[PDB]
């Protein structure tokens, strides 16, 4: 509904509802990641080599020793991780040991 | 010494005691003797009303 | 009265170890700290750490890093210094001095109040 | 964290007031009031002459007065004789249970 | 250095930011927080009073 002859001083950069929307979206994204978290036991050494056929420019396969649903036994598993997601760990030039970026 | 930061897990940092600079001494508390003595005297004076 | 006596003058070789004693007489030595200072001939004074004669607690100044060890015994009333890895810079005179009062309730170790001293041992190296 | 700064030598006629001062950092003199002074005859052991910052020990004539001001501690002597020719040193509580000695002066009589 | 009347050293190994390898750390704990788990006469196998 358009009003009759009202003049009102607006402002854009001093707005409470922008801050309210930002805090609501942040709290909603905090709430949506609550009941399903499943990547804390992946903080292990990843023995990453070059990928298949020698023509891959972004991925290394990063085979790791992981824990199955049974606690006593383990098994060998491989993947495909990206280069910005993977950070090597060493005190020297060790080209066959890498680490996931969020464990640090 | 300090809160020596020891890291456990992904992000948890607990703070524990380091060494002790200097000599070790007792941790104590000090209460004046005459004030405590006549405080107990006044408490006994008041409590003697309830026990003849 | 109160007297502090030490050993005789010692001549050594570089790379060896020197031992300086200090006997305390006239008072109960287990209630007072004992500090050690160093005087090079023609220079100022340098301070090494203190020894607590009751529990054997030690401190040491910097640029020493545990290359000097101080120990004591309560039987013969004598404090001991074992300084190792001698050098030509360490040609000096060593004194033992009586410090503060052990009080079991405050830290009186760092009090620079030295009354009685030994006559000093001359340690020279070739 | 070196030694306290100190004049190399001082001079004075008998009966003339002589002031000797040593300066330290904020962690040596400016925070702790344990600043003592020692003299020694050449060839003899040192001897205490001033307590914590300003107190006189027993068996000492009332001629040596010590005082501090900020990061500077000074010792003032009036009525000098020929027996005051000695080497005078500063010391202070340096923190972390360590003692730092001063450079030292030499007093010359006239 | 010397001997502290109330503090034990209690060096322990702990998990670093990766799961696979362990690192050795140390602290100084108080005497009323440390309990000797022992089925024999072992004077260096201690634990915290928490984990019971
Ligand atoms: C909570 O409460 C507790 C109490 O339960 C608190 O704990 C107390 O804390 C205070 C802190 O001030 C401690 O006080 C110190 O006391 C010692 C006393 O020991 C000596 O004095 C005995 C007699 O002195 C008494 O009487 C005289 C008068 O006759 C009086 O002037 C004096 O103040 C005192 O009241 C001696 O008998 C005793 O000798 C005994 O032991 C010998 C062991 O070897 C033995 O041989 C003897 O035969 C005898 O059995 C002992 O010598 C004081 O020494 C000390 O005062 C020093 O330090 C302060 C601070 O620097 C300084 O201002 C003083 O001037 C004095 O400085 C001297 O320090 C060195 C002491 O030798 C010395 O190296 C220095 O040169 C300096 O000069 C002294 O010696 C020269 C040369 O001899 C002399 O000419 C001078 O006159 C001078 O005396 C403290 O006052 C309490 O001890 C402590 N209580 C216990 C149980 O430990 C606690 O702090 C509270 N906590 C809180 C948070 O509040
Ligand atoms: C009780 O223990 C604490 C912790 O060790 C002592 O604090 C430390 O005191 C020393 C003074 O000797 C500080 O060293 C100085 O640090 C400054 C920093 O800029 C430096 O410029 C000086 O040259 C000197 O090295 C040390 O930093 C300080 N520690 C901390 C964590 O602040 C304290 O002195 C002890 N109590 C007593 C009465 O000695
Ligand atoms: C990534 O590299 C790893 C090397 O560890 C490969 O793992 C094995 O590859 C051989 C080759 O075919 C297979 O026979 C094995 O079965 C693989 N191991 C497992 C546990 O399956 C992995 O195949 C590579 N990934 C590729 C090429 O996509
Ligand atoms: C708003 O004010 C103007 C000025 O008098 C007037 O002409 C106009 O009619 C007003 N608007 C309404 C809806 O009355
Ligand atoms: C995981 O793989 C096998 C399975 O037990 C095992 O021999 C190996 O040592 C483990 N660790 C690594 C880093 O491969
Ligand atoms: C603790 O972990 C380390 C890993 O380096 C291992 O060598 C040691 O045997 C473990 N146990 C104890 C009691 O230190
Ligand atoms: C451990 O807990 C039990 C009860 O759960 C208790 O009886 C026992 O005394 C505790 N151990 C120690 C050493 O206090």
Residue B43 near chain E (CB below 8 Å): no
- Judge whether C91 and C123 are in contact, CB under 8 Å: yes
- Is D92 in contact with D32 (CB distance < 8 Å)? yes
Q: Where are the beta strands (DSSP E) in C7-103?
A: 10-12, 18-25, 32-39, 45-51, 68-73, 78-83, 92-101
d(CA C115, CA C2): 10
d(CA B13, CA D88): 51
Sorted by sequence, the CB contacts under 8 Å of residue B44 that are 6+ apart come out as none
Buried b vs exposed e over D36-48: b needs ≥16 C-beta within 10 Å?
bbbbbeeeebbbb
Phi and psi (nearest 5°) for A17?
-75, -20
Ligand nearest to the backbone CA of D94: 2
Q: Which residues of A touch E18 (CB under 8 A)?
A: 43-45, 89, 99, 103
Please state the φ and ψ torsions of residue D108, each to the nearest 5 degrees. -110, 125
DSSP 8-state secondary structure symbol assigned to residue A5: S
| CA of residue C124 relative to chain centroid, distance | 17
**C74 phi/psi in degrees, rounded to 5:** -90, 5
Question: H or E element: which one contains D92?
Answer: strand D87-93
Chain C residue numbers touching E1 (CB-CB < 8 A): 57-59
Cα–Cα dist C76/C70, whole Å: 16
Q: What whole-number distance in Å separates Cα of residue E24 and Cα of residue E15?
A: 9
Closest CA to C57 of C20, C102, C6: C102
Q: Residues D48, D59: contact at Cβ < 8 Å?
A: no
Please state how this structure was obtained: cryo-EM
What the block records as the tokens of C84 is 């190792």
Q: Which residue has the tokens 């201690």?
A: E46
Nearest CA to ligand 6 atom 8: E13
- What does the DSSP 8-state code read for residue D107? E
- Which run of H or of E encompasses B17? strand B12-17
Give the CA count within 13 Å in the CB-facing half-sphere of B4: 12
Is the minimum CB–CB distance between C69 and chain E shorter than 8 Å?
Answer: no
Q: What's the rounded Cα separation, in Å, for the pair D93 and C111? A: 7
Judging contact as 3 or more Cβ pairs under 8 Å, the answer for E and C is yes
Cα separation, B51 vs B41, whole angstroms: 15
Tell me how far apart the alpha carbons of residues C58 and C67 are, in angstroms, rounded to a whole number.
13
SS3 content of chain C, % helix, strand, coil (to 5): 5, 45, 50
Kindly state whether B28 is in contact with chain E, defined as any CB-CB distance less than 8 angstroms.
no
Residue of A nearest to B7 (CA): A104
Q: What is the resolution in angstroms? A: 3.6
**Secondary structure of E1-21 in HEC code, one letter for each residue:** CCCCCCEECCCEEEECCCCCC
How far apart, in whole angstroms, are the C-alpha atoms of residue C56 and residue C65?
18
Mutate to test the pocket of ligand 4, among A5, A6, A7, A8 (most ligand atoms within 8 A of CB): A5
Question: For residues C22 and C72, what is the distance between their CA atoms, to the nearest angstrom?
Answer: 10
Ligand 4 centroid to Cα of residue A2, in Å, is: 13
Which H or E run contains D18? strand D18-23
Q: Is A5 in the pocket of ligand 4 (CB under 6 A)?
A: yes
Cα separation of C90 and E22, whole Å? 44
Q: CA D68, D103, D5, C37 torsion: positive or negative?
A: negative
Give the angle subtended at the CA of C37 by the CAs of C36 and C43, to the nearest 5°.
165
Distance CA D83, CA D81 (A): 6
Question: Cα(C29) to centroid of ligand 7, in Å?
Answer: 46
CA separation for the pair D66, D60 (Å, rounded) = 14
Is residue A26 less than 8 Å (CB to CB) from chain B?
no
Q: How remote is the CA of residue E50 from the centroid of ligand 7, in Å?
A: 10
By alpha-carbon position, which residue is closest to atom 2 of ligand 6?
E13
What is the rounded distance in angstroms from the CA atom of residue C71 to the CA atom of residue C79?
Answer: 6
Nearest 10 degrees: Cα torsion C54, C59, C65, C67:
-30
């Amino acid at each position: 509904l358009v009003l009759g002859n009202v003049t009102e001083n607006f402002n854009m950069w001093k707005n409470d509802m922008v801050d309210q929307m930002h805090e609501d979206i942040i709290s909603l994204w905090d709430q949506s990641l609550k009941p399903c978290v499943k990547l804390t036991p992946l903080c292990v050494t990843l023995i990453c080599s070059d990928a298949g056929s020698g023509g891959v420019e972004e991925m290394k396969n990063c085979s790791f020793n992981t824990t199955t649903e049974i606690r006593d036994k383990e098994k060998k598993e491989y993947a495909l991780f990206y280069k910005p997601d993977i950070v090597p760990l060493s005190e020297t030039n060790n080209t066959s040991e890498y680490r996931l970026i969020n464990c640090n | 010494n300090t809160r020596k930061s020891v890291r456990i897990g992904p992000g948890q940092t607990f703070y524990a005691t380091g060494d002790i600079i200097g000599d070790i001494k007792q941790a104590h508390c000090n209460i004046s003797e005459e004030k405590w003595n006549d405080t107990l005297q006044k408490v006994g004076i008041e409590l003697q009303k309830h026990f003849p | 009265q109160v007297q502090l006596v030490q050993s005789g003058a010692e001549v050594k070789k570089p790379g060896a170890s020197v031992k300086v004693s200090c006997k305390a007489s006239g008072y109960t030595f287990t209630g007072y700290y004992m500090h050690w200072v160093r005087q090079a001939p023609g220079q100022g004074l340098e301070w090494m750490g203190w020894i607590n004669p009751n529990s054997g607690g030690t401190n040491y100044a910097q640029k020493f890093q545990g290359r000097v060890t101080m120990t004591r015994d309560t039987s013969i009333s004598t404090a001991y210094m074992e300084l190792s890895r001698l050098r030509s810079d360490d040609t000096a005179v060593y004194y033992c001095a009586r410090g503060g009062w052990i009080s079991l309730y405050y830290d009186s170790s760092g009090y620079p109040n030295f009354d009685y001293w030994g006559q000093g041992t001359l340690v020279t190296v070739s | 964290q070196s030694a306290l700064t100190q004049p190399a030598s001082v001079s004075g006629s008998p009966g003339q007031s002589i002031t000797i001062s040593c300066t330290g950092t904020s962690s040596d003199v400016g925070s702790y009031n344990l600043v003592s002074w020692y003299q020694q005859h050449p060839g003899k052991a040192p001897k205490l002459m001033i307590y914590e910052v300003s107190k006189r020990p027993s068996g000492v004539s009332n001629r040596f007065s010590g005082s501090k001001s900020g990061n500077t501690a000074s010792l003032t002597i009036s009525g000098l004789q020929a027996e005051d020719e000695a080497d005078y040193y500063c010391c202070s509580y340096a923190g972390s249970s360590t003692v730092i000695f001063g450079g030292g002066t030499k007093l010359t009589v006239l």
